[PDB]
Swiss-Prot record:
Single GO molecular function: fibroblast growth factor binding
Protein name in the entry: Sodium channel protein type 5 subunit alpha
Shown residues in whole-protein numbering: 119 to 1777 of 2019
Record carries keyword Transmembrane: yes
Disulphide bond pairs: 160-209, 502-511
Residues bearing PTM Phosphoserine: 846
TM spans (from-to): 13-32, 41-62, 72-92, 97-116, 130-152, 261-287, 321-338, 348-370, 377-397, 401-415, 433-454, 509-537, 555-576, 588-610, 620-642, 649-668, 682-706, 797-821, 872-890, 902-923, 933-955, 963-983, 994-1022, 1089-1114
IV repeat residue numbers: 853-1118
Residue ranges, Extracellular side: 33-40, 153-231, 253-260, 339-347, 455-480, 500-508, 577-587, 643-648, 707-751, 774-796, 891-901, 956-962, 1023-1040, 1058-1088
């Protein structure tokens, strides 16, 4: 047919493809709109027509029903098939939610662009290769969800309820008990500094409600209802949230607040294993799928002219590009000397300096135009780049626009190889890997418009249930930009806090579905891009005495003695909390112990000397460490007795006593090798930190140009939380004219962009996503210069942070991890009890045994033997234990008496089934319960089950203990762990985990030591800090246990902004200096210099230790 040939010619032709691509792109910019005008309706029709034409033009090219089979064989056209079907249905003949379907059109260009379909296809293999670790992750999450459910069932419903005294007449204190104390939130007491209920616990480790507030379980719900441990669904959600570490510290502090501080152990166990280990397993198998597919593709590929003479003679030898790099460095350094309150002459000086720098660059640019050839400038990319910045600078001479000089610092890339490694990464992100980035871009676009069509009217109408008062939420999906922002925040790792609000406004089923799909798919494709970037960038008495001391120092008892003194002295350090003032006996006890310690360590020093020699002593680095610390101690003692004591610097120098635990590093052959292999990689960390400091210098100068001085608030003193209305108070100066009453305080935000240093602090709080909320809120409210912030004026400043997060957090991370990996390779190329652990893992880890047991050949014995052996018996007892698991999942809080009756009956039924299996099994012939470790394991669990049943039988008659039940019942969890015998994936993964826990023990020991040093430092400084955002009555630095809680929390980087926040404040509107402090000190202030030092250094050292050591572990396992 002629129409057949015509349709085929249109099909193969390439102008049709670009026509449909432009049509899709315009339909995209038309989907991304909310509140479309009527002039859009025909446009809809328009698109419909074109797509239908596509359909015809292809099916008329097919021809028949066999051709229709071949056409539908490629699945991609099923999409626009459904698209035109839905179009005809909606245009011929409602819930109004069908409009959400045409976003499928946006996926069409993945099949139209022949490169994108390759990506979205090659991204399918890993998610079905993720199966083994996915079921291991679901299995561990469900195990720990049962554990957490049994431990904390209805614990999060504890509330510091007010005091209720019951009345005689029953059946403003007048009320009813339950209907008033369950649905009444008036009765509860809010947490200090929040509109959030206070939790409590009857235990002596939980929150202590103030006088006048008892503490019960009769409460509304958890925060919005979604953080319960009450059911297995809610508990599985809570443990998923703690696995992804999304706001996990909030659940940590809530649970410890109600359950007790000792359950801290639980949380660390679920972080040291749940978050870290399961997440890292998923990540490592994705990395393995990536390596495998890339090597698979690599294998598939393996299948007047006088004046010309004079000027060219003058420009023969420029030879001064080094002076140009120096002038660039001076230019950035000169731009960096910009701050908030600059004098007029200093501003004029900076302007003249950058003017003369522009002159320098313009002059040598026009010289380089005539130095070689304008075809040379047409040739090289660097020269094009400097030409661009010159034109942009002259445009400046003709807030965002001044910053384009900053790219000049990138000119250092030619001499700073790690900087050009960074730019190679950024050039692959949109170069050789442009398709991955483009796929991610259209996926974020699809998710943004899908979410906005699904949730726009919800977010817009029911906003009253999502914000404080008649006012907007900071995060929503009504506009496309805010939907993109929700998606981007999710990609950053914050999906629970906006999911709560979405489900509060929209609906749990659909919102859960979409946010979990966004998180899974987006984090998967972002990990794909991350890994792809990482892969694309790849007389004799004197001598007699000396040998006497040489004998006295090498004696093992001497070494154990000094180790014990080290440990005792550090433990003595731990006793230095705020309660020594009333501890009179142990005060002087610790005084004498301290002087004994310095004397014994200095005598040890002198004997080391006289034995080994001064050159043999002062060459060892750890001996230098010991000498330095004993020097600290000696000077402290000397100035303590020989006058000039409690004198400023000398009385604050004994704070350095907290370094005393560092003596332990040299002794233990685990910490020593760890610190060796760690400081052996400080040069790489230093050069990468230099590249990151230059990049964040760029971004901090941008933030100082954009909003420096625009972060002030002018809070009203009574309210305190929020700022003020622009209408009423507009300027900082009007904040000082209406200030006839001293309630107005023009405060900055704690972390702002006022210097390059405050810029660096804000960029660290944004790059870790802790504390960035207030940064970005004060930035997208930044109206004027000293002007009061309008609620979302300058809304597009979000872009700044987004861009920074992409270049300063994503790519720099690709830098960090990058060098680390390669660093280790070169170190790869160039505790004896743990060796015995190794040897025993070799010894008793016997895999294949001999013939286990022969048939007893008796009538009953042989029959029971034969019914025990067949694998059908194994699979059915596994089905039985899985049914026990499910009947374990059906337990909730405050369920009912009859249901718990039934559940206890089924409990006895199941322990009976399994103990019958046990009595049949040990009688296999004689030796079933001796050969395999699994049989004796289930033997232990079955006897534990029988003893648990009889303990449940003897609750009160013989002897009673209230809390122990909750843990003996927890032994039932052991039964589900019996499933580890059947599965092969999770068993091998958990065994390879248990093989490496000596290494994790050494790493956790170094981490514990760093926590100990920083706990003592914070006990010295950060006690008496005002109780604010992240420092409550339970997570302090007051005691040592509180310090360990705070520091374990921060070790995951979580909530570190909320703890640094009360260390920064220094003013009367927040602090109270001159406060009658109980100790020698005064004032409840933090000290910003050492607070920033402490927290930034602590999170950076913990990040470095964890990253370095975990990559070492992962490489040594590989
Ligand atoms: C990987 C991803 C992990 C995603 C975790 C999904 C858990 C979502 C939470 C959830 O399941 O919702 C709960 C659903 O509970 C159910 O009955 C459904 C059973 C969940 C099975 C999972 C499918 C909320 O139920 P509720 O009626 O609102 O409770 C009212 C309070 N009395
Ligand atoms: C970094 C990437 C930033 C990409 C999003 C920023 C630009 C989006 C934008 O501002 O336009 C927004 C809409 O953007 C589009 O419609 C184009 C979508 C592509 C404005 O919001 P609105 O209320 O829908 O009108
Ligand atoms: C099924 C789940 C499969 C894999 C789960 C992947 C989980 C790791 C996500 C990989 C992304 C990545 O490495 O870059 C992450 C950061 O990347 C970003 O910030 C993405 C924001 C820019 C959007 C796209 C560029 C690593 O930083 P993080 O704070 O530790 O991650 C927080 C949320 N993951
Ligand atoms: C297994 C996984 C999927 C099985 C079903 C899980 C989610 C079922 C969806 C669902 O129930 O949403 C129901 C309605 O679902 C819809 O509206 C259809 C829209 C979904 C479009 C599909 C787009 C997928 C995103 C890509 C319930 O409606 P609701 O207004 O959210 O509920 C009122 C408040 N409770
Ligand atoms: C090298 C590290 C030095 C080895 C010492 C490790 C911690 C031992 C010091 C903790 C002593 C707690 C002092 C104390 O009980 O004060 C009141 C705190 O008492 C507690 O609550 C128990 C503290 C348990 C922390 C043990 C780790
Ligand atoms: C087999 C399935 C039988 C389901 C028996 C549970 C009936 C409703 C009780 C229930 O859903 O408990 C709720 C827990 O939901 C579950 O049972 C989760 C079960 C996951 C699907 C089956 C996995 C085995 C919480 O209440
Ligand atoms: C390793 C890096 C530790 C950074 C040491 C911070 C030094 C303390 C800064 C300071 O005292 O500023 C005190 C507060 O005054 C300021 O506003 C400047 C703040 C400077 C903070 C700079 C922190 C840089 C951290 C980014 C590292 C990546 C004075
Ligand atoms: C091996 C891995 C490294 C392990 C531990 C690193 C130890 C880091 C020390 C902790 C630093 C904490 C901190 O910055 O707090 C501040 C520390 O002050 C300092 O500047 C001294 C820091 C010297 C630590 C150097 C030790 C290096 C150990 C390497 C091994 C407290 O300020 P203050 O001047 O003592 O108080 C005056 C106010 N009245
Ligand atoms: O073949 C496989 C055999 C097991 C192996 C080598 C691999 C997968 C997970 C691996 C584990 C992820 C855990 O994650 C880690 C890293 C640090 C912690 C976050 C948790 O433990 C490794 C010790 C743990 C691990 C690296 C040890 C080795 C494991 C490959
Ligand atoms: C047929 C020459 C195949 C593989 O050889 C090794 C090469 C290095 C590689 C791929 C592997 C080990 C650790 C790997 C790292 C664990 C880190 O953990 C992560 C988690 C996700 C990141 C956010 C942080 O670092 C990975 C990116 C990081 C990582 C997956 C990146 C890639 C690393 C395997
Ligand atoms: C993408 C992970 C999502 N969940 C974790 C994050 O939320 C924060 O985790 C951390 C908490 C404390 C210190 C460091 C980290 C890290 O990021 C290092 C992870 C890591 C693991 C193994 C090998 C290299 C690096
Ligand atoms: C009566 C009063 O003022 N406060 C009470 C307190 O005495 C009591 O210990 C607590 C719970 O027992 O309930 C509240
Ligand atoms: C920004 C500003 O004007 N702050 C002042 C504050 O320093 C002073 O203590 C108070 C007097 O009550 O008045 C107000
Ligand atoms: C602001 C104000 O009104 N008074 C403060 C005072 O409370 C504070 O102790 C002192 C030192 O910071 O600075 C001033």
């Amino acid at each position: 047919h002629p129409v057949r040939r015509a349709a085929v010619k249109i099909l193969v032709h390439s102008l049709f493809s670009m026509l449909i691509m432009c049509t899709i792109l315009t339909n995209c910019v038309f989907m991304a709109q909310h509140d479309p005008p009527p002039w859009t309706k025909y446009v809809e029709y328009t698109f419909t027509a074109i797509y239908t034409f596509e359909s015809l033009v292809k099916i008329l090219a097919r021809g028949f029903c066999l051709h229709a089979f071949t056409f539908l064989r490629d699945p991609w056209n099923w999409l626009d098939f459904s698209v035109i079907v839905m179009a005809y249905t909606t245009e011929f003949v409602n819930v109004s939610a069908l409009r959400t379907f045409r976003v499928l059109r946006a996926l069409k260009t993945i099949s139209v662009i022949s490169g994108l379909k390759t990506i979205v296809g090659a991204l399918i293999q890993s998610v079905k290769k993720l199966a083994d670790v996915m079921v291991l992750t679901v299995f561990c999450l469900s195990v720990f969800a049962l554990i957490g459910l049994q431990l904390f069932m209805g614990n999060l419903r504890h509330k510091c309820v007010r005091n209720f005294t019951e009345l005689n007449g029953t059946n403003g204190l007048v009320w009813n008990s339950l209907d008033v104390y369950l649905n009444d939130p008036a009765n509860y007491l809010l947490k200090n500094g929040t509109t959030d209920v206070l939790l409590c616990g009857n235990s002596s480790d939980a929150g202590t409600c103030p006088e006048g507030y008892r503490c019960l379980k009769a409460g509304e719900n958890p925060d919005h209802g979604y953080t319960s441990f009450d059911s297995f669904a809610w508990a599985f959600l809570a443990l998923f949230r703690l696995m992804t570490q999304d706001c996990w510290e909030r659940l940590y502090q809530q649970t410890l607040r109600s359950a007790g501080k000792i359950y801290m152990i639980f949380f660390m166990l679920v972080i040291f294993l749940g978050s870290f280990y399961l997440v890292n397993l998923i990540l490592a198998v994705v990395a393995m799928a990536y390596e495998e597919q890339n090597q698979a593709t690599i294998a598939e590929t393996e299948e007047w002219m006088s004046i010309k003479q004079k000027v060219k003679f003058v420009v023969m030898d420029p030879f001064a590009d080094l002076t140009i790099t120096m002038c660039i460095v001076l230019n950035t350094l000169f731009m960096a000397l910009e701050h908030y309150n600059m004098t007029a002459e200093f501003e004029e000086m900076l302007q003249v300096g950058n003017l003369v720098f522009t002159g320098i660059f313009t002059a040598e640019m026009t010289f380089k135009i005539i130095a070689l050839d304008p075809y040379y400038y047409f040739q090289q990319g660097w020269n094009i780049f400097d030409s661009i910045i010159v034109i942009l600078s002259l445009m400046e001479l003709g807030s965002v626009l001044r910053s384009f000089r900053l790219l000049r610092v990138f000119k250092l890339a030619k001499s700073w190889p790690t900087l050009n490694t960074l730019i190679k990464i950024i050039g692959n992100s949109v170069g050789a890997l442009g398709n991955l980035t483009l796929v991610l871009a259209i996926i974020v676009f699809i998710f943004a418009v899908v979410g906005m069509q699904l949730f726009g009217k919800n977010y817009s109408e029911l906003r009253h249930r999502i914000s404080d008062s008649g006012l907007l939420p900071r995060w929503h999906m009504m506009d496309f930009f805010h939907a993109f922002l929700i998606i981007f925040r999710i990609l950053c790792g914050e999906w629970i806090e906006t999911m709560w609000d979405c489900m509060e406004v929209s609906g749990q089923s659909l919102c859960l579905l979409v946010f979990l799909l966004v998180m899974v798919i987006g984090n998967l494709v972002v990990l794909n891009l991350f890994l792809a970037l990482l892969l694309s960038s790849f007389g004799k008495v004197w001598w007699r005495l000396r040998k006497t001391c040489y004998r006295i120092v090498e004696h093992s008892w001497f070494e154990t003695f000094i180790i014990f003194m080290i440990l005792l002295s550090s433990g003595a350090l731990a006793f230095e909390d705020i309660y020594l003032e009333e501890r009179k006996t142990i005060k002087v006890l610790l005084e004498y112990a301290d002087k004994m310690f310095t004397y014994v360590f200095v005598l040890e020093m002198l004997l080391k000397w006289v034995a080994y020699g001064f050159k043999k002593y002062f060459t060892n680095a750890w001996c230098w460490l010991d000498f330095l610390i004993v020097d600290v101690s000696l000077v402290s003692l000397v100035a303590n007795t020989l006058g000039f004591a409690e004198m400023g610097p000398i009385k604050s120098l004994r704070t350095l006593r907290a370094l005393r635990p560092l003596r332990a590093l040299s002794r233990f052959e685990g910490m020593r090798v760890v610190v060796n292999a760690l400081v052996g990689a400080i040069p790489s960390i230093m050069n990468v930190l230099l590249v990151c400091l230059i990049f964040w210098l760029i971004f901090s100068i941008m933030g100082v140009n954009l909003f420096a001085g625009k972060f002030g608030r002018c809070i009203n003193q009574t309210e305190g939380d929020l700022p003020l209305n622009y209408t009423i108070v507009n300027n900082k100066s009007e904040c000082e004219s209406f200030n006839v009453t001293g309630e107005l305080y023009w405060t900055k935000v704690k972390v702002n962009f006022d210097n390059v240093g405050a810029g660096y602090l804000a960029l660290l709080q944004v790059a870790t996503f802790k504390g960035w909320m207030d940064i970005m809120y004060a930035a997208v409210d930044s109206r004027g210069y000293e002007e009061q912030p309008q609620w979302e004026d300058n809304l597009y400043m979000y872009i700044y942070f987004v861009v920074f997060i992409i270049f300063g957090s994503f790519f720099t991370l690709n830098l960090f991890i990058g060098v680390i990996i390669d660093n280790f390779n070169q170190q790869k190329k160039k505790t004896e009890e743990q060796k015995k652990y190794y040897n025993a893992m070799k010894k008793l880890g016997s895999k294949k045994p001999q013939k286990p047991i022969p048939r007893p050949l008796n009538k009953y014995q042989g029959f029971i033997f034969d019914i025990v052996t067949k694998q059908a018996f194994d699979v059915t007892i596994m089905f039985l234990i899985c049914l026990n698991m499910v009947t374990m999942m059906v337990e909730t809080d405050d369920q009912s008496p009859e249901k718990v009756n039934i559940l206890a009956k089924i409990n006895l039924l199941f322990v009976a089934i399994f103990t019958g299996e046990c009595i049949v099994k040990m009688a296999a012939l004689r030796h079933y319960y001796f050969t395999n470790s699994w049989n004796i394991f289930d033997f232990v669990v079955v006897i534990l089950s029988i003893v648990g049943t009889v303990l449940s039988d003897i609750i009160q008659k013989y002897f009673f203990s209230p809390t122990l039940f909750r843990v003996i019942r927890l032994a039932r969890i052991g039964r589900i762990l019996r499933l580890i015998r059947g599965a092969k994936g999770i068993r091998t993964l958990l065994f390879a985990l248990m093989m490496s826990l000596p290494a994790l023990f050494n790493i956790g020991l170094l981490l514990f030591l760093v926590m100990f040093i920083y706990s003592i430092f914070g006990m010295a400084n950060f006690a008496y800090v005002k109780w604010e955002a992240g420092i409550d009555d339970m997570f302090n630095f007051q005691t040592f246990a509180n310090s360990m809680l705070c520091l374990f929390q921060i070790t995951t980087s979580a909530g570190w902004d909320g703890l640094l926040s009360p260390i920064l404040n220094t003013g009367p509107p927040y602090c109270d200096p001159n406060l009658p402090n109980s100790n020698g000190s005064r004032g409840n202030c933090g000290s910003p210099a050492v607070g920033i030092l402490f927290f930034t250094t602590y999170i950076i050292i913990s990040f470095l230790i964890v990253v370095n050591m975990y990559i070492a572990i992962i490489l040594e396992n590989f």
